[PDB]
Symmetry: D2
Subunit: 114 residues, 4 copies
Amino acid sequence: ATQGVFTLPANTRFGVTAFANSSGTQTVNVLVNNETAATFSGQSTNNAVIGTQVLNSGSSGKVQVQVSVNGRPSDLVSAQVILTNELNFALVGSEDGTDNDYNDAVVVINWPLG
Amino acid sequence: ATQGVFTLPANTRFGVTAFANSSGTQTVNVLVNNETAATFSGQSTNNAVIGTQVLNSGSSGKVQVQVSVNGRPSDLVSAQVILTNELNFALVGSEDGTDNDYNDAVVVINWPLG
Amino acid sequence: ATQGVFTLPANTRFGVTAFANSSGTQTVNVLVNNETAATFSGQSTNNAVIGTQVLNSGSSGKVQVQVSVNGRPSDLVSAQVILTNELNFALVGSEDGTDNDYNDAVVVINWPLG
Amino acid sequence: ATQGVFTLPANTRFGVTAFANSSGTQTVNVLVNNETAATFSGQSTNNAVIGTQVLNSGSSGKVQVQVSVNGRPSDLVSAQVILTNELNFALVGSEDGTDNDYNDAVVVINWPLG
Ligand SMILES: OC[C@H]1O[C@@H](O)[C@@H](O)[C@@H](O)[C@@H]1O
Ligand SMILES: OC[C@H]1O[C@@H](O)[C@@H](O)[C@@H](O)[C@@H]1O
Ligand SMILES: OC[C@H]1O[C@@H](O)[C@@H](O)[C@@H](O)[C@@H]1O
Ligand SMILES: OC[C@H]1O[C@@H](O)[C@@H](O)[C@@H](O)[C@@H]1O
Ligand SMILES: [Ca+2]
Ligand SMILES: [Ca+2]
Ligand SMILES: [Ca+2]
Ligand SMILES: [Ca+2]
Ligand SMILES: [Ca+2]
Ligand SMILES: [Ca+2]
Ligand SMILES: [Ca+2]
Ligand SMILES: [Ca+2]
C-alpha cells in the first residue's frame, strides 16, 4: 500500500520535522499538492534533527513525504493518529537498507499550530 | 481531555462494534449529531461482541461513544488511526472500576465500508 | 515493509475479530508462533463480522494475520496503537482488488481481556 | 485516564523532542523510572523546537512526560503507535488554557535509534 501520503484539512499550517538514524545522508522531500514545499538533507546516527519547518497544506490539503539516500528511494511506513479529535500526527518511518529498523529517516508532521 | 468523540467525513457509512470484559453489564450508546443512533447492552468477561451495527455519519459527521454501567458513566480513552490515508479506525476503551484495564467496554468504529 | 505482524506480551489472551467488505469471500488466517491458531471465512459488503475468537499469544507472543481471496494473498496495511499505556489494538486492513479501500477484510486484535 | 506515561523496552535509547505553540512558556519534564532525565523550556507560537535529546529507558523502561506553564500542570493527551512492529512513536499533546488545541507543548518520543 502507498505510504507517506496524508490528506490534511485545506489551508492549514502544519509542522514537519525530520530525524536521521543512518550512516547514509538522508534526503527528505515534502510535497504539497504534488509540488516540492520543503527539502531537508542531513546525516546522523544519533537521531539529530536534520530539518524542521512550518508549511501550509494549501487548497488541496495533499501532503506527501519522500525519503531517499543518494538518489535511491527508501521504503516507507506511515500512519496518522488523532488525539482528542483535534491534535494530529502524520508519522513516517523509512528504511534505506537491510536491517529494517525503519528509522533511517523519521518524519513527524503535526497540526494544528499556534 | 474529552474522549470518545470523533469527526467522520459527512454522510459516510461506518461500522460500530462493542466488546465486553467486565462483571458489570455494559451499556454502549452511540450518538450521531448529538442524537442516539445505536445502543448496545451486554455482559461478558471473555471479550464477547455485545453489539455491531452499520450507521451513517450524517450531515455533521459528529459521532460520540458513551459507556456506562448501571447508569454510571465509565472513564473513556480514545484515538483515531488512519492507515494508507484511507482506512479509518476510531477506538474507544472504558474503565468502570479500579483495576484500570480500560477494556470493560471496548468500542471499534471503522470506515469506509462496502 | 512487512504488515500484519505483531509482537504481543507472552502468554496473554487476546481477541481477534474480522469484518468483511467485498464481493469476494475473505479468508483470514491468524498465526501464533508461526502456526495457525484461527481461521475465519465469510463474505459481506456490509461490514459483517465473519469471525471472532479468543486466543493466547503463547511463549513467543508472535501473532501474524494473513488475508486471502480464493487463495490469493491480499495486500495488507497495519499498525498497533496503545491507549493509556495499557489498552492495545493491533489493526489490519487488506485490499483484494484495485479500488484501494483496504477494507475488504478488516481485522482487529485487542488485549488485555477479562 | 492517566496520560503521558509509556513503558519502553528496557535499556533502550530513545529520542524525545518538544515543540511549543502557546503564548506561555512551556516547561517539559521527562522522567525515567520516576526520576528527571531531561527538562526543556521555551516559548513559541510557531511550533519551534524547544528541546531535543537522546535518553536511555533504563532498567524499568518507564518514561513519563510532564508539561507545565508557570508551575501549573497542563492537561495531557497521549498514545503510542507502532509501525511495521518495529518503529515506535510515543506522542503527547498538552493544553495550558481554554481553546483546547492541545498543541501548547507537543512532545514526540521515538525509538529505536541509530
Ligand atoms: O548504511 C545504512 C544503515 O546505517 C546504519 O548505521 C543503521 O542506521 C542502519 O539502520 C542503516 O540502514
Ligand atoms: O466489576 C467490574 C470489573 O469486572 C472484572 O471482571 C474486570 O473486568 C474489571 O476490569 C472490571 O472493572
Ligand atoms: O471484487 C472485490 C471488490 O468488491 C467490491 O464490492 C468492493 O468491496 C471492493 O473494495 C473489493 O475490492
Ligand atoms: O495563553 C495560552 C494560549 O496561547 C495562545 O497563543 C494559543 O497557543 C493557545 O492555544 C494557548 O492556550
Ligand atoms: Ca535501516
Ligand atoms: Ca537506522
Ligand atoms: Ca476495568
Ligand atoms: Ca475488565
Ligand atoms: Ca478493495
Ligand atoms: Ca471493499
Ligand atoms: Ca491551547
Ligand atoms: Ca496553542
